[PDB]
Design a protein around this nucleic acid. Structure first.
Ligand SMILES: [Mg+2]
Ligand SMILES: [Mg+2]
Ligand SMILES: [Mg+2]
Ligand SMILES: [Mg+2]
Ligand SMILES: [Zn+2]
Ligand SMILES: [Zn+2]
Lengths: 163, 365, 365, 163
DNA sequence: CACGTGCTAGCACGTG
DNA sequence: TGCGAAATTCCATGACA
DNA sequence: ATTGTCATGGAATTTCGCA
DNA sequence: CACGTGCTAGCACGTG
DNA sequence: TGCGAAATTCCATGACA
DNA sequence: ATTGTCATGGAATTTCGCA
């Protein structure tokens, strides 16, 4: 209908548990559906409680129309349903067991998972501090399909840290 | 009585001849419109001018008039200004009557993340144990990030900015010479990520104008939102940030959010003109907006301003003068003129100070 | 959908006819240069304008623009300004963009002792146990008496002024509403000698301008005389007083001493023109000087000033606002317009306050 | 030669001892030779020490060319000679035992003496506080010889407290 | 620990 | 076009400090 | 070596709806 | 003793 | 008268606050 | 019921010394 855009859909899921990196066991992956832009928030549990702490920071920057997620506890709770509605964010859920996104998101979620796992065994139980870099890396990666980087697509300008 | 030839009707350059110069009491006198005055030998003049001036360390005219009461000689004011330029106390205590040159309006940073401006709002009335806000404003867009801290420390600044740079990395970060920003630990942090640190001149908050002006907007909204309620601002920064980032600047007709992204997110009263364009056609239009943004020109110079010139004698406004202490340092010299409003002087202590002209007055005489 | 006759091609006053108004989603829309906009029923408008404004308590334009994104209706700004005039927080927190009217230049007191202006300089760095100076300036001449006190108290003011009035008694004594001056004990003292007490408007030191300006001159000289020496000012007031009283005002060409007496005493650089006249011929010339003293006119009004009118809505600058608290009181009304710069308002507490217009802003809308 | 003027000569003398008015035993009379204007300074002794305390106040207002006095201790001392010279005040002394002034001063010094003595027995041992009034009174008195008051002659304008 | 740089507190009086 | 009303833009004033 | 800024609301002015 | 009115202090940081 | 230099006056800027 | 001021020093301008 009307072309895919930023903030049209944010895709979220959790990754963990991992080695206790300075006390943080999990990571909340948020990925913009159209730019592929990625935000990474280290959390101590895949709980609604901390999904809110983190997505508050994000939604203080910009606010998606829709959040897409799996039917994980943190995402299907009341609190989270009420938090979404307070801000006019529509919640969309993948049918259980059969996960879904778009092409782009599926690939980016793969990269994160691997790029995370590599700089997890190479640089061992100290991943917390490195998350900011993974994030820049991910956002400065070149998209095969589109001729641009997530940074470029979102901000519309060459990044000052190309990868 | 060296030039006394006047008494014998001789002419001496500068002394009117139509007057009559006689001798009484042992002094050379002159019949004048004003009355009868006394003409002292050149040697005694420096001393007299001094004595008169020192009565109340009076400026030009007030000094002249005092002397006029008893004496006349050619070009008294020339001898008077000589002394005023030599009185250390007057030079370092008197105010200036010359305005600063008209302000520069620096070019708006070309792209987002060319420049950050940073500053701390605070201390504030405690909220959840927090006392300060670190305000990061992007120069191009005006986009602003707000971080609550318990102290205006490198520690906390680093802690905050690491979160911020997860998103993107700035070429340059501008700040005032606030301790936390002029630390080595911070220069380190900046170096590791390849960000140039650029610092405002001291005691000159106009330089960090962008942040400071954004501060006002932050305080104004905070205040409005806290009317008739205890001042617990912590839980509100998130709201103020989103609010302010999404608020149209009338001259620009754009919101910092727009200038940063090209489309509104899911905030209320969301814009949707560029809804039918592709992201590509949308992102191009942005480049066009970003170039044709209104930009002010420098306002016209004051009738009685000044601009610094190399080698000029120039004094620095004393940082924080004690009570009954002079408000200006001993006179210095202009070395570099970095622009019509910024100067490198030989500091009184004595280093290279990069100072704003606002904290300078041109030395009189 | 009360005025929906537009959907059936009817005309409604204020709604352009060259446009086409259709229906989709369950809303009345309009095809526009800007894009497609939504027209809400009159009833829903107050609410919308509110919602938009409340996002960041934005002023006129910034509020309009937010609404423009989704909606159009005739004279939106008229509905917008309606709300801005009704938002308590904006009215009491926003700055004014209207300058004060141009300053009055009161007539110089006719004769010596018509008016005294009094004020305290201090606290200062302790000297011989003293901390303050009571500065009494005579309005006509500028003649100044300086009294060292240990405190800015009625006690000390009375103590000092008794010495001063031994010489002569003033018709009027003007002062700021500093406690020691607005005491009952002082009003008593004044009443017993038949002196009218006249008080400056609050938080407005321009009113006591004469003293305040003399203060500068006192501090400036003190400072000069204390350069590179401990700040022991006590033993110097006597010198500063004589010095300053005997120092020519360039525009007037006269010293406060002269204006007071007509001849210099045995101070250095003593004037002696009126030496050949009798005291009678001398005292007459004085009357002539005192009448033909230079007097400034009021400077031209700012392009965007205002002057108070009775019945006008007007707000008072909050005395000493706490951090993150609004800088203006709830709107009040002009009762008397004592002159173009002074006003009696219905105080917010709620009394008759005589306030300067400097501490006032006209209420918007 | 050149007409009598204010500050041309100040005539000083002491008056006392008197009843201990709040600790003050004496009074220093200063009278301007030409206006007859009078300053009254209560002192605790007819000493150079306190002649200086008081005349400092006065000479912080205006400074006479000449001081005329009797050969009293306080006036013929070194200190006082040195104090006078510091300020360029010439000291003139009446020949001992045969006192002198002008007509005007002699009369004014009489008035003070009597006006003092009357408001000394009528209002008894509390004269200190009243000195300011005596002073205004004296300065607002009409001069028989000249058609004006000391106030009028000095300040050149009608006083705001006529007597 | 005083110093430079950034910030906002504070104390004194007379009166209810 | 041209005219009256409406909309939009001009801008100096003040607060960050 | 670095540099003032922009929300604001009456007043000035340009655009718009309709002939 | 908090309040109004007049005034000037003060504390926090990083660094030598 | 007129001309060049000297004197005097104009004034906006800042500090009291 | 009360209200800005004036010292200051380059720049503008009027006066002065001499023909
Ligand atoms: Mg999961
Ligand atoms: Mg700041
Ligand atoms: Mg004062
Ligand atoms: Mg005797
Ligand atoms: Zn001097
Ligand atoms: Zn509001």
């Amino acid at each position: 209908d009307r072309p895919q855009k930023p903030f049209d859909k944010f895709f979220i899921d959790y990754i963990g548990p991992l080695p206790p990196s300075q006390g943080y066991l999990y990571v909340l992956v948020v990925v913009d559906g159209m730019t592929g832009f990625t935000w990474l928030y280290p959390t101590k549990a895949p709980s609604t409680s901390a999904t809110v702490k983190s997505l508050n920071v994000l939604t203080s920057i910009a606010i998606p129309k829709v959040i897409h997620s799996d039917q994980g506890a943190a995402f299907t709770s009341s609190t989270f349903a009420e938090w979404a509605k307070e801000r006019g964010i529509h919640l969309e859920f993948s049918t259980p067991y059969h996960p879904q996104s778009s092409g782009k998101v599926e690939r980016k979620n793969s990269d994160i998972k691997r790029l995370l796992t590599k700089l997890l065994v190479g640089r061992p139980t100290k991943w917390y501090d490195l998350l900011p870099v993974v994030q820049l890396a991910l956002n400065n990666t070149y998209s095969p399909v589109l001729k641009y980087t997530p940074h470029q697509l979102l901000f519309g300008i060459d990044s000052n840290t190309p990868f | 009585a060296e030039l006394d030839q006047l008494l014998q009707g001789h002419y001496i350059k500068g002394y009117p001849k139509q007057y009559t110069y006689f001798l009484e009491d042992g002094k050379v006198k002159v019949s004048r419109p004003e009355g009868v005055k006394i003409i002292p030998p050149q040697s005694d003049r420096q001393k007299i001018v001094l004595q008169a001036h020192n009565l109340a360390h009076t400026g030009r005219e007030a000094t002249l008039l005092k002397i006029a009461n008893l004496y006349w000689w050619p070009n008294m004011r020339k001898d008077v200004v000589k002394q005023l330029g030599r009185c250390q106390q007057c030079l370092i205590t008197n105010a200036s009557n010359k305005a600063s040159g008209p302000i520069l309006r620096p070019d708006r940073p070309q792209k987002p993340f060319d420049k950050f401006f940073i500053d701390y709002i605070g201390p504030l009335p405690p909220s959840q144990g927090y006392l300060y806000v670190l305000v990061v404003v992007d120069g191009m867009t005006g986009f602003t990030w707000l971080y609550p801290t318990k102290a205006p420390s490198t520690s906390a600044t680093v802690k905050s900015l690491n979160v911020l740079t997860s998103i993107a990395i700035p070429k340059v970060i501008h700040s005032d010479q606030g301790a936390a920003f002029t630390s080595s630990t911070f220069a380190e942090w900046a170096k590791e990520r390849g960000i140039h640190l650029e610092f405002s001149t001291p005691y000159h908050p106009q330089s960090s104008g962008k942040v400071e002006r954004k501060n006002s907007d932050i305080k104004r909204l905070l205040t409005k939102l806290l009317v008739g309620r205890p001042t617990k601002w912590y839980d509100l920064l998130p709201v103020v940030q989103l609010a302010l980032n999404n608020t149209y600047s009338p001259v620009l007709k754009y919101t910092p959010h727009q200038l940063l992204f090209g489309i509104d997110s899911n905030t209320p009263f969301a814009n949707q003109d560029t809804l039918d364009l592709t992201r590509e056609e949308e992102l191009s239009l942005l480049q066009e907006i970003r170039t044709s943004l209104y930009h002010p020109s420098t306002p016209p110079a004051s009738s009685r301003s000044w601009s610094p010139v190399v080698g000029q004698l120039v004094q620095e406004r004393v940082a924080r003068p004690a009570s009954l202490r002079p408000r200006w340092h001993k006179p210095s010299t202009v070395l570099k003129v970095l622009n019509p409003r910024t100067v490198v002087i030989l500091d009184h202590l004595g280093n290279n100070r990069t100072v704003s002209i606002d904290n300078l007055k041109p030395t009189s005489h």
